[PDB]
Design an enzyme around this catalytic site. Structure first.
Site: not given
Lengths: 233, 246, 234, 92, 246, 216, 249, 245, 238
Positions: F1-2
């Site tokens: 993620t991110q």
């Protein structure tokens, strides 16, 4: 044309050596560095009594705190001053301090030799400059006089004179002036060599004197205040 | 010939002479003569053959640009004749122009069009003295798609036209008249003969002869339109036959 | 990296209405190939020397008779490379006209535009103007036309003119001779006879090349055909 | 790849074909002796395959083979045609 | 700005060949005298070369650089007519003048123009293709202080303030003839300045007031170019006067 | 993620610096989207003979960082002195190019781990696509930042003198959480060790998870 | 080398003026002549073509006088080659100014702008200045009917009757002698134009093929620029016979 | 060789009447005065050897260099005027680096040899630049195309080479490469063989003592151009002294 | 003549005459000695002045606080190369953030000074730079000529009869690396006098000192701030 890459076997340009001879016919400029100011003297070249000393100058402002007096070929001086003026004003916005007398002299010195017969651009030339400029102004390191020459070298000097005879005008200045002295004696010392090297003799519309003290702005002298400096030659 | 008179500053400049000669171009012919390369080219109906000498200074070589046979496009092939330095620069320019044609045209280029593009570019050189013309000479060979095998020759200047058979190198004129007799005698065009007739002519004009390894033959056959170098083996097949041929 | 060399004027005015270096270019076209052009008044026919005098010539498309477009053809005398650029430029110009008008470029117009580059090369340093003169044909205004554009960039208007070997002598013979109201077949016969007078040596069909412009359009005559015309006339 | 000495289409020029020609002249008289009685065409052939090379240089080498060969060939009335033919190829 | 030689090469004289050659080029733009009054600063030029088939506007040495700065030109020589080379310095000078009006919208300063011009000539030296200049201009105009200005510039790159200066046919000579004529009364009286300009031009030219066209410019009003016909009326009286000072 | 704007991703890059060596662990599983396109892929590049690179984040943005990296080493060789880079200069010069690249709409949170010793200077550098570059003890960014970095940092704060062995068992454990949590891979890793004298990296070998999360 | 030659193109010569500019005037002398004359209700241009040949086809009927615009006209005096480039620059300038202005282009304005390009080359660029002096005829409201003359030297002139090309000194006087200030109307002026061309040529005999005559006459609401066909000029060639008597008388 | 100092070299765009510019002929003459730099192509790499001039015991590797890495896998050994050789290295370094950005593989030398030879010819064409005053060799080991050795003269000819040497005696060194078969050799044996030839060929008239500096792009340097490994250097050094004797 | 001013005419040795003149220009210029250690780099340069009522022009110029240069030759030609060296070093510092190696920087300068030697009608520059720098490896003194040719030396001296200074330097070559900042200057002083006549030794106001390192920031000593570094010299070693 005839060679403009011309080196002597010693290892300097012929063209640069030729550049000095032009200065010699031109105007005369004296710059003296004092503890108490910088005084700048320059030939106005009278030739009618109708030319107004207040309206026209040849002591000109680089900044509101810095002056330059010109000698040798007049056209050549103007080109160096206009690039130097902008460099100086741009410096003032950015740093917020007055520009060192040395800092401006280094920039102009780049232009003196860069010539060549072909591949020339504005940064280059077809023949080296024959003007020597005396950049005098007061900065935060104190009053300084820096001297720039036709060979495009910068040197600190507490007295330099360049004119009809460059070396001649400097030898008169070597006899009189002393390194640390009062403003009136420095202003006197500038006028005194000036009349002797020249064909022309000292008057109050013959020469132009303006003095920059530290803690003052550049002041171009009034009709009366120009005449006050004439009493002591 | 003429060396020209100046009335401009004609002497080191390509600009006119009263002959109509361009100084730099005439100097471009002397560049051919520097290299030592001479080529004989023959057109058929089975194939177009270009045959030219390969330079050996020493036996430590790799053949990838010692070669004067070049691929100027996969179907149509060529040789540069003359001074090898001028040849490499021209081949280089041409290939970037050739690739440009590939982006525009989208396919294999006709021999007539290929010679015409090089000709326009070399018009830039010929008019300038800013950059001297490249004193190489190119004979393009290849099969134009409907017409057949074609042999076209461009000069350093860029003059091109079709011919029954052409020659380039140290002396164009002497090589051509030898070739003209070969053309009059018009042989049955099949693979063995067109290669062999080319090979016999280049050997007669020099009067030094050679082995197959010493020359490089490049053909564009109706058999494979690809531009092909025969190599040592295949040329040898013609040579042994040629000996038995009178 | 960069190139200089020659960028000062190479061309100096001569009192004659022309510069010295261009005058010399006109001698170049004279030592060029024989090319004749006669306006038949129902098409224009232009004929050129096929050979470059090696006498191995095998033409199928490599001609010096070239269609630029639908109704414009060019035959030249002088330099090969200088000519190829004019042909490439001509198609771009014809088409430039074709886009705007939906008709290609009239004779007069094409001449004005080609002429401007030829002069460009004169005045400028480090270039030389073309060594080529053009016989330009076209069908515009409902009339066939023929123009001469010289290597200078000057233009002289001609119903019949000759270039190549003995060009000067060629123009006077045409000025007196020139014909009009000619059938297509006759157009070829007259054109070949005029070519016989300019060009020396043998003529067969791989020595001379003929192209015709008429109403149907410009095309270039097959080597078989030229031969039949050549034989026919005295 | 090949690196050092002779190339892969260059430098085969001085040694390969020329050497073969020099060696076969030496071999020749033994082989010629059998030829007069019969079977000449195989004997001249070995040398001929080499001789097919068209260099200036090979001719000079070729002067050596003929000297021995002419003696038997002249002697006979059928051998003689064959040497002479080869020589016609060289000129043609 | 393209050439292939230097435009000048230095001498051990300390003159520029091209600036001195330019000084003659600007005396092609004939003789111009300008005197400064109290409120009307006036310049007048030599030759209108009237044949009554011409226009008077086209030959002018008087050029409007702005509508509150104007100049008349020359320097030294005696060489042939031609407005044109001088005209070119005007075309640069007029942009230079106009760019300043954008920067400072009040009647633009004389000082700015002269300084820009000196530097402009040095700059042209540096470029190999650029032709230098060396001219003198009689800059006339007004400040935002409303006071009269008459400035003059030289080929030596140097500009000076003056009450009267003349240029043309020997710059020092026409100038000296004015030095005699000058008195302290002359500059405040409006009427007196006009007569000075006409006596100087009347020396080198036959039958002036047809070859004397002068313009007065004012503090509040822009350039007014006077008709020649009203100038001739002055010339007749003034020529009487001209002999008197001599 | 991110990870704004990614397609082909390298999920996680471990980097922990010990005394004269770094161990970086990166998976061979290289998802082109959710699908694992390549089950084995070496995401280890040779900057130089004396430098090594290991990278995490989108793999396409990594090949871009690779071409830029590559030229810088060339420049140094280019002089003729035949110098090998310093870890700080190459990583740092590129951090600036990541400040410029933000403004146009392509995004980068590209994250590389440089350990080198070259010339005479020992660097551990991490360089980002947003241009957070720093010297470190241990770092990892992007998807590494969301889940392994904080446990790695928590151990790192009272014991700043973790060794390559304690880290090894931990790398194996954390990647077990990646096979299960991340949708860009199912296990299998390459173990790369950078040194200040040679670039070392055994080829990608399978690893497989251990189940105990259906007991309660 | 290039450093050992002279041609003094951008470099000033001992004269104080360039060789290249002065030489261009000599080339103009032996090339076909162009004159513009003033009439009360129009202006006209009459020119001698650069073709001395006895056979022209008339492919381009502008070989000297080109009509740029529907408000303007030009002539060429000099080499046709430098004219070709200049003609193309003129079709653009003349129409551009008009797009903006919506008023017939001022004769003065056009020439000064053009003259600036002629001088630009000689001063810099290392190109020679065009070998062509262009004779512009046009009409604007604030000067009236105009004729302006262009040089390679960048000199312009406001004229009412002038001629440039071959034997110019004779030609301008001859136009002054027959035609004073504001004297002669448009029709009678066209005759006068041919009369001077017959006398002054590079090579004698004035014919339809050798001459091209152009009229600017203001029609009903539009200023009409036409180049006259060979047929109309011929009626003027007989008119020019009548005119010779008329000047004398 | 033809050239005269007056005429047909007073601009760098002036073509000589012989077909080969005087300036290019002058550029070759400078290569002929300089020291010998050799580079021999092996089956498993290329081994360079160029003699590094020592005029003082103050000098380090940086002084009087003649081994450049154009790429970082491709080497350049130059001989002749050092000033132009180092400038052409800088433009070449840029040209290689841009290629690597785009193409993304160990560059094939065959493409370099054409582009560089044309660039060297360009400078003969143009007025603002004059021909390069060195002859140089480009040498690489790659897996894309193997070992490759090319030499470019200042004329702007590219030819392919098994083993070339350029110096004060170009012909004697090339016959000596011919005698030995590199076909029999691997990259290890070649280092010995380059080392001797440099000592014998070179005639002191301007040296005073030189240091031989050699570079590998071979087996024990993995397709990147590194200076010779220590073991290889010592094997090479002994044989060179032994060959003298 | 004019075949010696052409940058397109060469000798049969293959040397352009314009490059040859350009090397000599250095040699007429004043002598400068540049030495390195393994912590510092020292630039000692000989001054000049126009008058007794003047201070001497720094021949040590300020670039950065980690790299510094000293000139010998023409100042105006110097200033163009100086504007180039300041631009590249500062670039390096922003983008790379490495305290730039000397060795990379001189090679690029070599490229530029080579361009006028190839140009027709343009003269080579003729100033000599001894560039002192400190990177993380340690100090280097590289000397770049008016041609490309650049030297990596422990110590070098360039100017009039500079070969003689090298001899002192060679005798103390090893020592330089052990010695201190203070001593490196004193060994410089002792080399600098060899170039000049043996009739003359140095004085306090003709010596300029430029000290470089990152254990210290860049300093220029002028004419009276020279004295502490100056003490310890031997009068004319022969």
């Amino acid at each position: 044309d005839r060679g403009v890459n011309t080196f002597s076997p010693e290892g300097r340009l012929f063209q640069v050596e030729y550049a000095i001879e032009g200065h010699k016919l031109g105007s005369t400029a004296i710059g003296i560095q004092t503890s108490e100011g910088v005084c700048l003297a320059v030939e106005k070249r009278i030739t009618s009594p109708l030319m107004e000393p207040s309206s026209i100058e040849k002591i000109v402002e680089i900044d509101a705190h810095i002056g330059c007096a010109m000698s040798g070929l007049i056209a050549d001086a103007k080109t160096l001053i206009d690039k130097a003026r902008v460099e100086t004003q741009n410096h003032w916005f950015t740093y917020n301090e007055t520009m060192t007398v040395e800092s401006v002299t280094q920039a102009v010195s780049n232009l003196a030799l860069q010539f060549g017969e072909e591949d020339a651009d504005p940064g280059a030339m077809s023949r080296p400059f024959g003007v020597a400029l005396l950049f005098g102004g007061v900065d935060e390191k104190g009053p300084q006089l820096f001297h720039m020459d036709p060979s495009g070298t910068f040197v600190q000097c507490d007295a330099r004179a360049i004119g009809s005879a460059s070396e001649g005008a400097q030898s008169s200045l070597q006899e009189v002036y002393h390194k640390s002295t009062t403003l009136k004696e420095a202003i006197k010392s500038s006028l005194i060599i000036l009349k002797q090297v020249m064909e022309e003799k000292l008057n109050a519309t013959n020469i132009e004197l303006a003095t920059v003290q530290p803690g003052q702005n550049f002041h171009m002298f009034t009709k009366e205040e120009l005449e006050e400096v004439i009493k002591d030659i | 010939m003429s060396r020209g008179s100046s009335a401009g500053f004609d002497r080191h400049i390509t600009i006119f002479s009263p002959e109509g000669r361009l100084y730099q171009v005439e100097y471009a012919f002397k560049a051919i003569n520097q290299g030592g390369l001479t080529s004989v080219a023959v057109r058929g109906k089975d194939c177009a053959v270009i045959v030219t000498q390969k330079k050996v200074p020493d036996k430590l070589l790799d053949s990838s640009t010692v070669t004067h046979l070049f691929k100027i496009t996969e179907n149509i092939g060529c040789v540069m004749t003359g001074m090898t330095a001028d040849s490499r620069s021209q081949v280089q320019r041409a290939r970037y122009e050739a690739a440009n044609w590939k982006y525009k045209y989208g396919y294999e280029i006709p021999v007539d069009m290929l010679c015409k593009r090089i000709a326009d570019i070399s018009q830039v050189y010929t008019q300038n003295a800013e950059m001297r013309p490249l004193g190489c000479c190119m004979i393009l060979i290849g099969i134009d798609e409907e017409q057949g095998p074609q042999v076209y020759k461009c000069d350093p200047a860029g003059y091109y036209c079709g011919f029954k058979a052409t020659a380039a190198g140290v002396k164009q004129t002497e090589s051509t008249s030898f070739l003209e007799k070969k053309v009059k005698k018009k042989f049955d065009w099949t693979f063995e003969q067109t290669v062999e007739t080319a090979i016999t002519c280049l050997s007669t004009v020099l009067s030094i002869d050679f082995k197959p390894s010493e020359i490089e033959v490049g053909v564009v056959t109706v058999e494979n339109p690809k531009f092909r170098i025969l190599t040592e083996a295949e040329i040898d097949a013609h040579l042994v036959a040629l000996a038995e041929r009178d | 990296m960069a190139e200089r060399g020659y960028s000062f004027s190479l061309t100096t005015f001569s009192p004659s209405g022309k510069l010295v270096q261009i005058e010399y270019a006109l001698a170049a076209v004279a030592g060029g190939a024989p090319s004749v052009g006669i306006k038949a008044a129902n098409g224009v026919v232009l004929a050129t020397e096929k050979k470059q005098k090696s006498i191995l010539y095998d033409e199928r498309s490599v001609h010096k008779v070239e269609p630029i477009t639908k109704h414009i053809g060019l035959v030249y005398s002088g330099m090969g490379p200088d000519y190829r650029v004019l042909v490439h430029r001509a198609r771009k110009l014809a088409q430039q006209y074709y886009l705007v008008y939906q008709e290609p470029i009239p004779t007069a117009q094409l001449v004005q535009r080609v002429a401007s580059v030829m002069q460009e090369y004169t005045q400028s340093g480090g270039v030389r103007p073309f060594g080529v003169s053009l016989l330009i044909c076209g069908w515009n205004e409902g009339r066939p036309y023929l123009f001469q554009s010289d290597p200078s960039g000057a233009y002289f208007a001609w119903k019949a003119t000759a270039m190549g070997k003995n060009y000067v002598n060629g123009k006077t013979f045409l000025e007196k001779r020139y014909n009009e109201d000619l059938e297509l077949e006759d157009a070829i016969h007259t054109a070949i006879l005029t070519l016989k007078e300019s060009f020396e040596g043998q003529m067969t069909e791989d020595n001379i090349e003929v192209g015709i412009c008429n109403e149907a359009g410009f095309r270039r005559l097959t080597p078989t055909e030229v031969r039949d015309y050549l034989a026919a006339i005295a | 790849m090949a690196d050092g000495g002779s190339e892969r289409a260059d430098g085969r020029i001085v040694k390969m074909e020329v050497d073969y020609s020099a060696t076969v002249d030496q071999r020749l008289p033994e082989c010629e002796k059998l030829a007069k009685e019969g079977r000449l065409q195989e004997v001249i052939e070995t040398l001929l395959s080499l001789e097919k090379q068209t260099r200036t240089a090979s001719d000079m080498v070729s002067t050596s083979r003929i000297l021995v060969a002419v003696v038997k060939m002249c002697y006979e009335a059928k051998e003689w045609d064959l040497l002479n033919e080869n020589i016609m190829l060289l000129s043609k | 700005m393209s050439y292939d030689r230097a435009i000048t090469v230095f001498s051990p004289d300390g003159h520029l060949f091209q600036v001195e050659y330019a000084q003659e080029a600007v005396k092609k733009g004939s003789t111009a005298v300008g005197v400064r009054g109290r409120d009307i600063v006036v310049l007048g030029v030599e030759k209108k070369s009237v044949a009554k088939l011409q226009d008077e506007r086209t030959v002018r040495k008087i050029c409007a650089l702005d509508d509150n700065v104007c100049m008349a030109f020359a320097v030294v020589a005696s060489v042939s007519g031609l407005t044109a080379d001088a005209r070119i310095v005007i075309n640069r000078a007029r942009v230079e003048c106009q760019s300043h009006r954008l920067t400072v919208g009040d009647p633009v300063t004389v000082e700015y123009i002269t300084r820009y011009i000196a530097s402009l000539k040095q700059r042209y030296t540096q470029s190999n293709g650029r032709r230098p200049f060396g001219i003198s201009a009689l800059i006339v105009g007004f400040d935002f202080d409303g006071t009269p200005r008459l400035y003059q510039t030289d080929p030596s790159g140097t500009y000076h303030a003056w009450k009267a200066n003349a240029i043309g046919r020997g710059a020092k000579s026409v100038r000296e003839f004015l030095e005699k004529n000058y008195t302290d009364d002359a500059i405040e009286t409006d009427d007196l300045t006009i007569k000075l300009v006409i006596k100087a031009l009347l020396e080198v030219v036959q039958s002036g007031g047809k070859n004397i066209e002068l313009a007065v410019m004012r503090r509040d009003q822009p350039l007014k170019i006077l008709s020649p016909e009203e100038i001739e009326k002055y010339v007749a009286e003034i020529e009487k006067e001209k002999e008197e000072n001599e | 993620t991110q990870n704004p704007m990614v397609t082909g991703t390298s999920v996680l890059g471990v980097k922990f610096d010990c005394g004269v060596v770094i161990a970086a662990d990166m998976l061979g599983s290289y998802g082109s989207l959710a699908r694992f396109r390549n089950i084995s892929r070496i995401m280890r590049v040779n900057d130089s003979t004396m430098l090594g690179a290991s990278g995490d984040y989108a793999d396409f943005q990594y090949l871009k960082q690779v071409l830029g990296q590559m030229v810088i080493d060339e420049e140094l060789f280019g002089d003729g002195h035949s110098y090998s880079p310093r870890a700080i200069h190459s990583w740092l010069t590129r951090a600036m190019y990541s400040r410029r690249s933000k403004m146009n709409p392509l995004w980068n949170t590209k994250v590389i781990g440089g350990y080198a010793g070259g010339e005479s200077f020992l660097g551990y550098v991490d360089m980002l696509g947003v241009a957070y570059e720093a010297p470190s003890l241990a770092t990892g960014y992007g998807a590494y930042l969301a889940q392994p970095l904080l446990r790695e940092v928590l151990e790192k704060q009272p014991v700043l003198s973790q060794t390559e062995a304690r880290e090894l068992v931990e790398r194996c454990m954390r990647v077990l959480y990646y096979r299960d949590a991340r949708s860009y891979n199912r296990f299998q890793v390459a173990t790369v060790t950078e040194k200040g004298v040679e670039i070392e990296g055994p080829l990608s070998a399978q690893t497989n998870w251990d189940i105990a999360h259906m007991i309660s | 080398m290039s450093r050992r030659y002279d041609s003094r193109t951008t470099i000033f010569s001992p004269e104080g003026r360039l060789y290249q500019v002065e030489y261009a005037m000599e080339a103009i002398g032996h090339a076909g002549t162009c004159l513009g004359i003033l009439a009360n209700d129009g202006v006209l241009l009459a020119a001698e073509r650069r073709n001395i040949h006895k056979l022209l086809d008339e492919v381009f009927f502008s070989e000297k006088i080109y009509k740029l615009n529907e408000d303007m006209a030009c002539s060429v005096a000099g080499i046709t080659s430098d004219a070709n480039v200049l003609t193309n620059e003129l079709r653009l300038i003349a129409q551009r100014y008009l797009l903006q202005y919506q008023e017939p282009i001022p004769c003065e304005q056009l020439v000064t702008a053009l003259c600036d390009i002629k001088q630009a080359y000689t001063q810099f660029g290392g190109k020679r200045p065009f070998g062509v002096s262009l004779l512009y005829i046009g009409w604007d409201k604030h000067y009236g009917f105009q004729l302006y003359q262009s040089d390679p030297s960048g000199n312009y002139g406001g004229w009412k009757a002038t001629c440039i090309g071959n034997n110019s000194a004779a030609a301008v006087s001859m136009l002054k002698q027959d035609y004073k200030e504001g004297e002669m109307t448009l029709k009678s002026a066209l005759a006068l134009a041919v009369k001077v061309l017959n006398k002054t040529m590079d090579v004698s005999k004035l014919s339809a093929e050798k001459v091209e005559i152009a009229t600017l006459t203001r029609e009903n609401g539009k200023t009409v620029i036409r180049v006259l066909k060979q047929k109309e000029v011929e009626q003027l060639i007989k008119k020019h016979e009548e005119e010779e008597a008329k000047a004398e008388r | 060789m033809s050239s005269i100092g007056t005429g047909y070299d007073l601009s760098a765009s002036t073509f000589s009447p012989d077909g080969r510019v005087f300036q290019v002929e002058y550029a070759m003459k400078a290569v002929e005065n300089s020291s010998t730099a050799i580079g021999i192509r092996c089956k498993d790499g290329v081994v360079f050897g160029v003699e590094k001039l020592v005029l003082s015991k103050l000098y380090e590797e940086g002084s009087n260099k003649r081994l450049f890495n154009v790429d970082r896998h491709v080497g350049m050994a130059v001989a002749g005027l050092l000033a132009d050789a180092r400038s052409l290295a800088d433009i070449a370094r840029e040209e290689a680096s841009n290629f690597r950005s785009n193409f993304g593989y160990n560059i094939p030398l065959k493409h370099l040899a054409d582009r560089v030879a044309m660039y060297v010819h360009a400078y003969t064409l143009y007025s603002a630049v004059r021909p390069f005053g060195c002859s140089f060799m480009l040498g690489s080991y790659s897996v894309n195309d193997g070992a490759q050795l090319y030499m470019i003269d200042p004329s702007g000819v590219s030819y392919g080479y098994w083993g070339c040497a350029i110096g004060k005696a170009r012909q004697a060194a090339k016959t000596e490469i011919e005698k030995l078969q590199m076909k029999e050799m691997t990259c290890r044996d070649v280092v010995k063989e380059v080392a001797k030839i440099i000592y014998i060929v070179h005639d002191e008239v301007k040296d005073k003592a030189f240091e031989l500096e050699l570079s590998w792009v071979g087996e024990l340097t993995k397709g990147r151009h590194e200076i010779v490994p220590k073991d290889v250097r010592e094997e090479a050094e002994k044989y060179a002294k032994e060959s003298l004797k | 003549n004019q075949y010696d001013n052409d940058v397109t005419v060469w000798s049969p040795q293959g040397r352009i005459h314009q490059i040859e003149y350009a090397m000599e220009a250095v040699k007429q210029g004043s002598a400068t000695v540049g030495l390195k250690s393994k912590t510092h780099a020292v630039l000692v340069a000989l001054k000049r002045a126009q008058s007794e009522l003047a201070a001497h022009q720094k021949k040590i110029l300020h670039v950065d606080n980690h790299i510094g240069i000293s000139i010998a030759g023409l100042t105006a030609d110097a200033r163009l190369l100086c504007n180039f060296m300041r631009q590249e070093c500062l670039d390096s510092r922003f983008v790379f953030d490495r305290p730039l190696p000397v060795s990379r920087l001189v090679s690029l300068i070599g490229s530029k000074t080579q361009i006028p030697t190839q140009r027709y009608g343009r003269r080579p520059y003729g100033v000599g730079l001894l560039i002192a720098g400190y990177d993380d490896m340690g100090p280097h003194v590289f000397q770049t000529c008016p041609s490309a040719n650049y030297f990596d030396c422990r110590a070098m001296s360039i100017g009039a009869r500079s070969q003689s200074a090298r001899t002192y330097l060679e005798r103390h070559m090893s020592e330089f690396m052990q010695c201190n900042l203070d001593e490196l200057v004193k060994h410089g002083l002792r080399a600098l006098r060899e170039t000049l006549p043996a009739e003359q030794d140095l004085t306090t106001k003709n010596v300029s000192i430029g000290i470089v390192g990152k254990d210290l920031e860049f300093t220029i000593y002028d004419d009276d701030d020279v004295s502490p570094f100056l003490d310890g010299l031997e009068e004319r070693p022969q």
